[PDB]
Each structure stands twice: as C-alpha cells, then as structure tokens.
Amino acid sequence: AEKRTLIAVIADEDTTTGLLLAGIGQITPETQEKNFFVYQEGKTTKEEITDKFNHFTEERDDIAILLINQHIAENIRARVDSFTNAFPAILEIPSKDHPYDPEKDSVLKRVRKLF
Amino acid sequence: LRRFDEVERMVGFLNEVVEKHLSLENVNDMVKEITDCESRARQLDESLDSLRSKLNDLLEQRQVIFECSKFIEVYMITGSIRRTKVDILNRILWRLLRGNLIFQNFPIEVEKDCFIIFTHGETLLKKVKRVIDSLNGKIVSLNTRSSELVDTLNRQIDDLQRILDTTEQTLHTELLVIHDQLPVWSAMTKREKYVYTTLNKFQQESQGLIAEGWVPSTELIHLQDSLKDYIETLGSEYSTVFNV
Amino acid sequence: GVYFNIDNGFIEGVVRGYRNGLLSNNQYINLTQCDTLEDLKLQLSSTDYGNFLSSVSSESLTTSLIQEYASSKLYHEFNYIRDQSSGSTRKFMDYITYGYMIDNVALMITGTIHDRDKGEILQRCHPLGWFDTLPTLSVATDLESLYETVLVDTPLAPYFKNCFDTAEELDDMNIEIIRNKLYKAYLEDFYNFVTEEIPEPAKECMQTLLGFEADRRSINIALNSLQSSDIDPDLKSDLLPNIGKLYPLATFHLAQAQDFEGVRAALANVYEYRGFLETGNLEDHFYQLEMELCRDAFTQQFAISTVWAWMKSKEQEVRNITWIAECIAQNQRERINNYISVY
Amino acid sequence: MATALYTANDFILISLPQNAQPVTAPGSKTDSWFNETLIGGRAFVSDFKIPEFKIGSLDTLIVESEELSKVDNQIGASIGKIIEILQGLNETSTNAYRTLPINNMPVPEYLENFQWQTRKFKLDKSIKDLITLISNESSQLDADVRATYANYNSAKTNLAAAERKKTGDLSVRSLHDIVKPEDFVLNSEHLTTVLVAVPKSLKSDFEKSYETLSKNVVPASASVIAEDAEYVLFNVHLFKKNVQEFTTAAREKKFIPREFNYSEELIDQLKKEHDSAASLEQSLRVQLVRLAKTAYVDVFINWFHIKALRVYVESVLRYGLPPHFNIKIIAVPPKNLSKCKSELIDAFGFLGGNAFMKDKKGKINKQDTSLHQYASLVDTEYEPFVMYIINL
Amino acid sequence: AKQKMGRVMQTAAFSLAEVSYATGENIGYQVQESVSTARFKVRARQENVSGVYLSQFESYIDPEINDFRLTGLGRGGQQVQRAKEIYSRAVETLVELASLQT
C-alpha cells in the first residue's frame, strides 16, 4: 500500500522542466532539496549523478518512479543496473537527441537471460 | 575543403607563433610537413608558456619571502595575490574578523601583490584561507626559516630558467626553417581552398563536372584555343565539351 | 521626406540593404528541402547570413546554436545601426531596447526566487536589453529594495508608477504583474514619444505597429489570466495598455472576461482581430499579422519605422530558421512549412 | 532631527572595557560620563551588566559570535512580525510596542531590572545551548502567530461568501433565508422550481411573459421571494422536462436564471455554513490578540538576552581582558539619537584602533542611498567600538 | 512502449526548447524552483497475478497547480502555455505506461 507518491527525475533541462509543467515532481520544502536533478550533456559531471541517484533511491523512501534518460543512465551504468528493486521502479526512457536502443535499459538486460 | 580549412588554421597558428616568438602528390607530401611541424611547434610552445608560468610561480614566492622577512626585521598568513583583489580581500577579511587584524600589502617588483594578515586568535584560520583561496591567492607558509627555503627555491629558479633557455633556443632554431617558408605554405592553401570552393560550384551530373559561367566574347576563341591545346598535350584521351 | 536624409540618410539605406537579406519564399523552400543541419548551414551560407556558423565545424552544431548566432548577428547589425544614430533617431533606438530591458528585468528577478545561479540566468538574457546594473538585480527579493537600489538610475525608472509594493517580497505570481505593468507604462510612453517627436510618415505607420503590440499584449494578458490567475477586473485593467486599436470598448470587456467566451465575444466586435480565436494557432495569427503590418511599413520610404519593421521581420526570420532547423534535426516534417513569409 | 521621526524611547547598547577612559572628557570614568556628560545630561543610563557563563574555548568563542549575529537577526524578524500584526488589527494601540511595558513595567525601567532574567535560562547552562534554545523558542512562538493569522484570513473569506448567499447579489446568491413551502415545491413527482433573477425594469415584462415562455408552467407562481437592489428574484413552478426550455428562452429575453431547486438538506447546510464561518472567525480573533501579547513579552526577554550575551561575547573576543566587561544600556530621548551616536564615537573609538576609525557620520532613512549606516557586517564601514543601535 | 514514450516526450521537448530560446533567457531554471507540489501522484495497490503479489500504481490528479506565475508574462507567456499543454497530455500517458514497469 501507499508509501510512495512522488515521480522523480534525472534528465536534461528541457526534458526535466517539461516533466514539471506536466506536474510530476516537486521540491520538498523542509530540506530545501529537489526530487529532480537537472543535467546538461558533456557539461555536468558523471559523479553528481551518482550521488543524486543515491538521494532518490535510498534516502527518499517516497519516490515511486525514478525516471531516467537513457544517455544519462549509460554514464552511471553500474548504479542503475545494480539496483534491482521495484521500490522505486526504474524506468529508462530514450534520451532527447537519441533513438530507442533496447540495451540501454536495465530491466531488459536482465530479462534476456531466464524467462 | 574542410581539410584545407584545418590546414589554413594550422598555417595561421604558425603565423601567430612566429609573431609571438602543383600535383596532388606534391601537395599531399607538403601538407604532411605542415602538420608534422605544427604538432611539434604547438607542443613546444605549450611546454614553454606553461613553464614560464611555473617560473613566475617561483619568482612570486621568492618575493613574498623577501618582503616578509623585511617586515619582521623592521598566527600570521603570508602569500601572493593579484593587485586588483587586495582591497576586496581586505574588506572581506575585515567583515569576517570584526576588526581583529593588521593587514599590510607590499607590491611584488599581470601585476601582483603580497599580503600579511595577523589573524589574532584561532577558529577562523581555516576560514581566512577560504577567502584567500577563493579569489586565487596563493599562501606561502614557511614555518622553518626565511633563509633556508630561499636557497632551495633559487636552486629551482635557475634550474628551470636553463630549461627555458634550452626550449626557447630550440624554438628559435625551429622558426628559422619556417619564417622563410610560410609564404609558400600559406600561398598553397590560399589557392587550393580557392580551387575547391570553385569546384563546389560545378554540377557533378554523370561522372563529369559541368562548369556554366560567363566569359567576354573577345576571350571565346582564346578559351577554345587554350583548352583545346591543353587537353591534347597531356594525353588522357577524353576530350572536353565547350558549348555556348 | 525633405528633411529625412540629414541625419537618417546613411541609416535608412543600410537598413533598406538589410531588408534585401530577408529570405523570400523560395529561399525558405530551399531550406525545407535540407536533410542535415550541416546542409542547412551550407544553404544559409549562400544567403546574406554567409559564414556566420563558420566557427562551429559540424560537430557542436545544434538547433539552439543556430538560433544563438543568427540572432547575435541581428543584434550586432542593430548595434551598428544604433551607433550611427543621433538625436531623435538614437532616442527612438533606445526606446526599442527598453522593451527588452523589461523582459531581462523580469527574467533576472525570477532567477533569484528559484535560487538559480547568476552566471547562467544571464546567458538566457537578451543582449539588446542590457543596462549596466542588470546583474545587480540578484541582490534583493522585494520590489522596493530592487527599485530604490538598482532601478532608479535605469531608464525603466518612470515605468514604476503603478507597481504597488505591499511589502510582500516576490512570488512568481506578482513578477508577471510587474512585467505586464512595466510593459504597459512603456507602451504608453513610447506611443507618446512616437506621436510627439517622430515625423509624420513614420508616425502613422509606427502608431499602428505599436498599437498592434499593445493589442497582442492585451489579448495575451486577458487570455493567460484564465488558467494561472484569479484576479479582480479592477486590478486586471491596470495591466492592459491604453494606446491601441482595442482599448476604449474592448479592453473593458477583456477586463471582465471570466471565460474563454468572454474573450471571444469581446474580440468579435473588433474588425481585424475577429477570427483569430476561432481556428488555427493564435500565435501564428499574431505573427502573420505582425509581418503583414511590417511589410507595408517598408513601402513608405522616408520613415524611421523601417528600423522597427526591419528588426521585427529579421526576428521572425530567425524564428522561421529556428523552426526549420528544429524540424530537420528532430526528423519531424509534418509542419515544416509552418513558417511565415511575406517577403 | 527631521530625517526620522521618534516619539518613543530609543536604546544604544554599548560595552566597553572597565579600564576605559573617554577622550572627549579626559578625567572622567565611563559610568560617571554617561549620566552627567552625555547628551546634555539628559541621557537615562540603565544597568545591563551580566556575568560570566561557561566558555568552551577561545576556539569556541569564534563559533559563538557568528551564531549570535544570526540568531539576533532572526529573533528581530519575529518580534517585528508580531508587532506588525497587533498594529495592523488596530484592537491594540498602534502608538505603543516601542515603549509598551514588558512584565507590566515601563521598557527603559525593564532594561534597568534586566541583569540576565530567568524564565528557563540560567547562568550555569553552556552558551552554545543558550544560543540554540532561545532561537527555538522564538521561532515556535512566531510560527504559532503566523498559523492563527493564516486561519483568521481563511475565515474572512468564508464569512464574505456566506453573507453574499444571505443577501447580496444574484450571480452566486443561494437561498435559505426564504424557506417557505408556498414559494417552493418538494415531495413532487411532476413539478420542480426554477428561480429567475430579473433586472428591475424588466420585472413587468417577466410577469407577462413567463407562462407562455416555456410550456407547462404553473400559473400564478410569480412571487418576489427576495430582492436585492439590482435584481428581483422570482419563483416559478414548472415541468422537469420544460426547465431546459425555460432557462434557454429566458436568457434571450435578458433574464438570468439562478439554478436552484428546493431540497431540505441544501437549505439547512447553507445556514450551517454561514454559522460556522462566523463562529470560527470570532474565536480566532480573540485568540489572535491574547496570543500575540503573550508571545511578545517572551520574545522581548529572549531578544535582549541575545543582545546582552552578544555584546559581552564580542567584547571578550576583541578586548580579551578584563574578564568582566562594563555593559550599560542607554535610553536615549527622541531626536537626540544623532547627537548620541556622535559623542560616543568620538570618545571611545580610539580604543578600537586608528585603522578601525572611518568617517561616514550621518544617517539616511530614505532610500536615496545606502551609505551612512554603521554595522560591522558590511565592508563599506564598521563600528569603532562595540556599539549596537536598537530601534523599537 | 519505450519507443512510444520517447517519441511523444521528445516532440513536446522540442516544442519547449524553441519556446525558451524565442522568449529570451533560460526559463527552465525559474520554473523548477517555483514548483513545489505535484499534480500527478500515485496510490499503490497490490494485485495477485500468477499467485504472486505485485505492487501496482494508480494515478490521481490533484488540482493543487494548473497555472503558475511563469505561464503568464504577456506575449512571451502565451508561448509557454501552448508548450505546457502538449507536455501534460504526453506525460500523463507516460505515467500510466510506467505502472507496468514496477
């Protein structure tokens, strides 16, 4: 039952802002920290994504779905794959400026061996 | 054409370094000696300016010892700073430590400046350093002597000045074969890019270019007598077609 | 046209030369046939844009860098025309940039409520609306300490005449109110400047180009107030400009417009704006009417309204090139011919 | 003066070394000077001395100063918000809360009996937990005032809405003040009631036309159930099928239908809504005044403690010795603030050091410039001896 | 579904990006701070499929926010508004599809 209500994001600027207009993530008022992480490609470090991921999965116990741009999941690949829980669900979506590759998607990788 | 844009940029870099101190095979082997010399000139210039900066980082450290042993001979922090940030560092440290400081400055003779702080107390000593290191001030802590570090630092100033005198001699040796050769390497590219820019203006229809363009009527027979003699004198039996 | 070319002889003939670089319909069809952003760069290189993306070289070329550099050369051409201006012309050029200064003020004081960094909320600012104390709007939160510290020495200072600061500092709801009210007072002042000192052929065709800005801003304020605003009409009527074709009878009905039909029945009584709210993209209707009003401002010769009619047409050209380069980079071509070309 | 109005007692807090001497009057003690010399002898000087607490270290001394500056602001923000509210309502003087009695003792006298007051605060607690403790109490008291004031505005909104239904104007007015069974039908299989809001001119036109306007309308159903001042309200009885046809035909005539239909539970629930709104606002208002005075006296005591602590702590940091520092708080008469600030600056400033000494004397209260206003925080200028100017 | 979500999300992405550039300044930083509540949340329910208990998500759309103070600016504001509407419609579908993922 209910224990998770937010949908969070790790995505590039135009992708993140748009998700917010649609009305899915928010910033907590008590901690002063976002439940989205903005990213810009080549410009913002691989390390910061890795922390923010930990903030969202393990320190937030209220994130229901963690959405993540495929290009971005590919930078911190170990971190996305190694988390096998559905709590949060990890949903890799094709990153802006890139098509759908079925093997930049962590759940599908796992699916292939043993049906 | 992007090739002879890149090679034009490389000839421009060779023209900046000196100011700072044909068949297809005959172009293809001279672009090789443009690139093979641009590579060594760029790496030797980048191993020279980044070494001049390391030289000035020691000549600024000698002076902040010479101008702060003199201040003692006439909880303190000694370092270098750019001269345009001395007043703002004075104001930020005066607003951080409410009073509680004796701030001097002595000009090192980009222009720079020295500073002495005398942080009278504790618990802000790692916070003054977050003011100094934020606006690019290089503190020089000595803690041993003002006469033992000067010897170990003058044993590096001259040891690195000799590396300057080696690499800059190699630079001026390399520029002798280039300064008398740049009017050939430049004038090759200025007309080769001009050839390919004009060859972009042609048709490329059926494995043969179609050149449509204007010529005065006096020079029609000159084209029909110079193009006809030239395609026959070199062999290559595939004649051109000149229509009006 | 007898005293125009004393101070404005060289200024017009270069702007008239800048007009000839406006892309025609065939030069837009030749851009819609491109397959790559590199092919679109090489197609623009044969126009009067030639080699403006030369320092990019096919790797870092995105559809936003084209919109950056194509508008940057617009801004440098505007600065070249403004540097040769003197007297009433230079003041007319300053009054154009005041409306971009207002947008940069309203974009700079929203980047401090959200605590976004000051170095990245200024690269999104407009280069023509630059005043020397524009980065120093990141010093306070409330309106009074941003006026009385920064915005007194700016030329936007007479425009803070109705912005009532009730000591509530700033949310995102009242910065839009301050923006609309500054633009309202600015449209009033620049209409009175055009009516006062600008000569007669460049007066009647500039009052229409400026009353259109007022009418478009009135319709956008009265239509964006449905979704993200719950305000009284007596406080809404301080946001609508009173210079336009739409003021004395229709902005009253746009002030008490509580529904979409309160806007639509108000704009059905005005003759040239009826049918905009029925079918099609409304923003395309306003941009099309803007270009049809800027086209017949080049047809009057000895007029300083040709500068306004040039820079708005060149901004629409940069918007059309940006829309095409957005279509040919994201591989969507269902609405590539949605550009606007009257030239 | 005339660049600022004062009409209530103003305070400057000074702390000085107990070995000090004024150079504006050499041959005087600091204590003797305050009473006799300072602003024409009309200065009232009050005791404000507090003793030693427990200091962590020298190291700790630094951390404490920083916090003290911050908590002092924050409490200052809170006390200003409480006063602004009490003033705003005008159910308590607007002309006090600058020299309004704390613990029912005049404010310069309150400071005179202020020697480090005890409410929950003792001299045998550590200084770090007194800085923390105090701030937590101040923030709780203010957050309470903010919530009750928040509630009082939501209550005002509800009372206006409910009132409008009870008699306003017909564009949201819902009826429950008329409850007659002769003006409405209920327990009915074929009939319903539609209320029509009609302009006063048009009343005659409505009376003629209604029966024939829709088909199947109860005749002699026109009664004026209610009237405002712009509109007239009628009840019409008609067929459920035919209600659609009446609303539509009526609009063409320039009548405005008000969709209401008689049910007992709606009528009762409209009267209750109005009743609960009134009761909620009235309870909230009394609670709001009582709470704000009680919270105000506690925050006043809290704030002055941070000012006392702070001035002592800052003295200890800048001067070191003597271990006990001579703190006095001087209550200045209105309009003699400018003269006070200058005489102390001249006299004591020399002790802080010549580097420390800047001239930017004067005061601008208008927003024309931001120079001429002392505070150690800014790099623009600095106080030249431990001096805080307190303006209630 | 992954292809579906990516294409629809990106179309709306491109529309917002053009809008940002035309309006002047990087609007998106401003919007992120200002937003501090969410419309689309989920309430989780257990569904027994194939003798195992799974977690499922059911979306509820809260009307806390529907317009901000950045979707109104005047003329520039009308553009953000047209963008916002494509993004809300596109995203809501994406949330429902995301439910199968968990």
DSSP string, E77-99: HHHHHHHHHHHHHHHHHHHHHHT
Number of H helices, E strands in chain A: 5, 4
CA distance linking residue D292 with residue D307, whole number of Å: 22
Q: Which of D369, D351, D367, D349 is nearest to D359 (CA)?
A: D349
Q: Which residue has the tokens 């280039």?
A: B178
Reported residue count of chain E is 102
Contacts of C199 (CB under 8 A, 6+ apart): C3, C4, C304
D56 shares its domain with D141: yes
D336 shares its domain with D314: no
CATH number for position D235: 3.30.70.100
CA distance linking residue D80 with residue D82, whole number of Å: 6
Of D322, D337, D368, which one is at a domain's C-terminal end?
D322
What type of residue sits at position B22? L
DSSP letters spanning D320-388: --SSS-EEEEEEEPTT-HHHHHHHHHHHHHHHH-STT-----S---SBTB--S---SSSSS---SSSEE
Put simply, the answer to whether D62 touches B100 (Cβ < 8 Å) is: no
Taking the alpha carbons at both ends of chain C, their separation in whole angstroms is 25
Put simply, the answer to whether C172 touches E30 (Cβ < 8 Å) is: yes
CA distance linking residue D347 with residue D64, whole number of Å: 29
D207 shares its domain with D59: no
Classified as helix, coil or strand, D11 is strand
**C110, C111, D389 from C114: Cα distances, Å:** 7, 6, 34
Contacts of B61 (CB under 8 A, 6+ apart): B80, B138, B140, B153
Token code pair at residue B67? 């101008």
Q: Which of A18, C228, A23, C137 is nearest to E73 (CA)?
A: C228
- Estimate to the nearest angstrom the gap between the alpha carbon of D330 and the chain centroid: 28
| C-alpha radius of gyration, chain A, whole number | 14
Contacts 24+ apart (CB under 8 A), C44-50: C44/C321, C47/C21, C47/C23, C48/C20, C48/C21, C49/C21, C49/C73
C109 phi and psi, to 5 degrees? -90, 0
DSSP letters spanning C150-171: TTTSSTTGGG-SS----S----
Angle between helices C172-197 and C88-108 (to 10 degrees): 180
Are the C-beta atoms of residues C132 and C155 closer than 8 Å to each other? no
Nearest C-alpha in B relative to D375: B95
DSSP-assigned letter for residue C15: H
Reported residue count of chain A is 115
CA distance linking residue C177 with residue C235, whole number of Å: 10
Token code pair at residue D376? 């150690």
Token code pair at residue B184? 């050939």
Are the C-beta atoms of residues E65 and E41 closer than 8 Å to each other? no
**A97, B163, D244, D250 from D239: Cα distances, Å:** 63, 108, 10, 15
In which region does residue E51 sit, left (phi positive, over 0), alpha (psi from -120 to 50) or beta (all else)? left
Q: Which of C215, C187, C340, C208 is nearest to C277 (CA)?
A: C215
CATH number for position D390: 3.30.70.1180
DSSP-assigned letter for residue B116: E
D273 shares its domain with D164: yes
Are the C-beta atoms of residues E5 and A105 closer than 8 Å to each other? no
D157 shares its domain with D287: yes
Are the C-beta atoms of residues D214 and D238 closer than 8 Å to each other? yes
Kindly report the nearest CA distance between residue B118 and chain C, in angstroms: 32
Provide the H-helix boundaries in chain E: 2-23, 28-34, 75-98
Of D274, D303, D322, which one is at a domain's C-terminal end?
D322
Token code pair at residue B120? 């009278």
Q: Which of A17, C50, C179 is nearest to E73 (CA)?
A: C179
Q: Which residue has the tokens 């308590």?
A: D92
D137 shares its domain with D286: yes
CA distance linking residue C259 with residue E47, whole number of Å: 43
Put simply, the answer to whether D376 touches B95 (Cβ < 8 Å) is: yes
CA distance linking residue C65 with residue C207, whole number of Å: 35
DSSP letters spanning B61-94: HHHHHHHHHHHHH----EEEEEGGGHHHHHHHHH
Contacts of B30 (CB under 8 A, 6+ apart): B185, B188
Classified as helix, coil or strand, B180 is coil
Q: Which residue has the tokens 């003939």?
A: C13
| Sheet arrangement for strand A36-39 | A36-39, A6-12, A63-69, A89-93
What type of residue sits at position C4? F
In which region does residue D40 sit, left (phi positive, over 0), alpha (psi from -120 to 50) or beta (all else)? left
Token code pair at residue C10? 């060289």
Nearest C-alpha in B relative to C57: B2
* Closest CB to D379 among B95, B123, B124: B95
Could you tell me which residues are beta bridge partners of residue D168? none
Give me the total of CB pairs closer than 8 Å, taking one residue from chain A and one from chain E: 132
Q: Which domains does chain A have, with CATH numbers?
A: 1-115 (3.40.50.10580)
Beta strands in D200-339 (DSSP E): 224-227, 231-239, 256-258, 326-332
Classified as helix, coil or strand, C211 is helix
D139 shares its domain with D212: no
Are the C-beta atoms of residues D194 and D236 closer than 8 Å to each other? yes
Domain that holds residue D361: 5-49+323-392
D257 shares its domain with D196: yes
Kindly report the nearest CA distance between residue C148 and chain D, in angstroms: 6
Provide the H-helix boundaries in chain C: 9-19, 25-32, 37-44, 63-83, 88-108, 144-147, 172-197, 201-224, 233-236, 252-255, 260-264, 282-295, 305-327
Classified as helix, coil or strand, C64 is helix
D42 shares its domain with D54: no
Q: Is D81 exposed, middle or buried (0-12, 13-18, 19+ CB in 10 A)?
A: middle
Q: Which of B64, B70, B80, B82 is nearest to B153 (CA)?
A: B64
What angle is formed at CA C256 by the lines to CA C251 and CA C261, rounded to 5 degrees? Answer: 90
DSSP letters spanning D151-213: HHHHHHHHHHHHHHHHSS-TTT----S---SSSS--S-SSEEEEEEEEESTTHHHHHHHHHHH
Could you tell me which residues are beta bridge partners of residue D224? D234
Q: How was this structure determined?
A: cryo-EM
Token code pair at residue E17? 């990006």
CA distance linking residue C130 with residue E45, whole number of Å: 55
Token code pair at residue C175? 């910065």
Are the C-beta atoms of residues A63 and A8 closer than 8 Å to each other? yes
Positive or negative: CA dihedral B167, B168, B170, B174: positive
What type of residue sits at position D256? I
CB contact burial D310-321 (16+ within 10 A = b; e otherwise): bbbbbbbbbbee
CA distance linking residue A112 with residue A97, whole number of Å: 26
Classified as helix, coil or strand, E54 is strand
Could you tell me which residues are beta bridge partners of residue A65? A7, A89
CA distance linking residue D178 with residue B145, whole number of Å: 100
CA distance linking residue B234 with residue E26, whole number of Å: 63
Q: Which of B47, B78, B85 is nearest to B61 (CA)?
A: B78
Q: Count of domains in chain D?
A: 3
D120 phi and psi, to 5 degrees? -160, 5
DSSP-assigned letter for residue C51: S
Q: Which residue has the tokens 């005065």?
A: B216
D214 shares its domain with D149: no
Q: Does C57 touch chain B (CB under 8 A)?
A: yes
Q: Which of D174, D193, D191 is nearest to D183 (CA)?
A: D193
Q: Which of A80, A14, A12 is nearest to A43 (CA)?
A: A12
Of D261, D279, D311, which one is at a domain's C-terminal end?
D261
CA distance linking residue C273 with residue C219, whole number of Å: 10
Resolution (A): 8.7
C67 phi and psi, to 5 degrees? -65, -30
Contacts of D275 (CB under 8 A, 6+ apart): none
CA distance linking residue B154 with residue B150, whole number of Å: 6
Neighbours of D275 (CB within 10 A): 11
DSSP-assigned letter for residue C336: T
DSSP-assigned letter for residue A55: I
Could you tell me which residues are beta bridge partners of residue B164? none
CATH number for position D282: 1.20.1460.10
Find which of E19, E26, E39, E84 to mutate to test the C interface (most C CBs within 10 Å of its CB).
E26
D78 shares its domain with D166: yes
D269 shares its domain with D256: no
Token code pair at residue D131? 């800085």
Say whether the peptide bond before residue A88 is cis (omega within 30 degrees of 0).
Answer: yes
Q: Which residue has the tokens 């809001």?
A: D197
Positive or negative: CA dihedral D32, D38, D41, D42: negative
Kindly report the nearest CA distance between residue C152 and chain D, in angstroms: 9
Angle between helices C282-295 and C305-327 (to 10 degrees): 140
Dihedral angle over CA of B123, B128, B129, B131, nearest 10 = 140
Contacts of E54 (CB under 8 A, 6+ apart): E46, E47, E48, E102
Classified as helix, coil or strand, D217 is strand
Positive or negative: CA dihedral C29, C34, C37, C43: negative
Q: Does C65 touch chain E (CB under 8 A)?
A: no
Kindly report the nearest CA distance between residue E55 and chain C, in angstroms: 35
Instruction: Write out chain C residues lying below 8 Å of B5, CB-based.
Output: 57
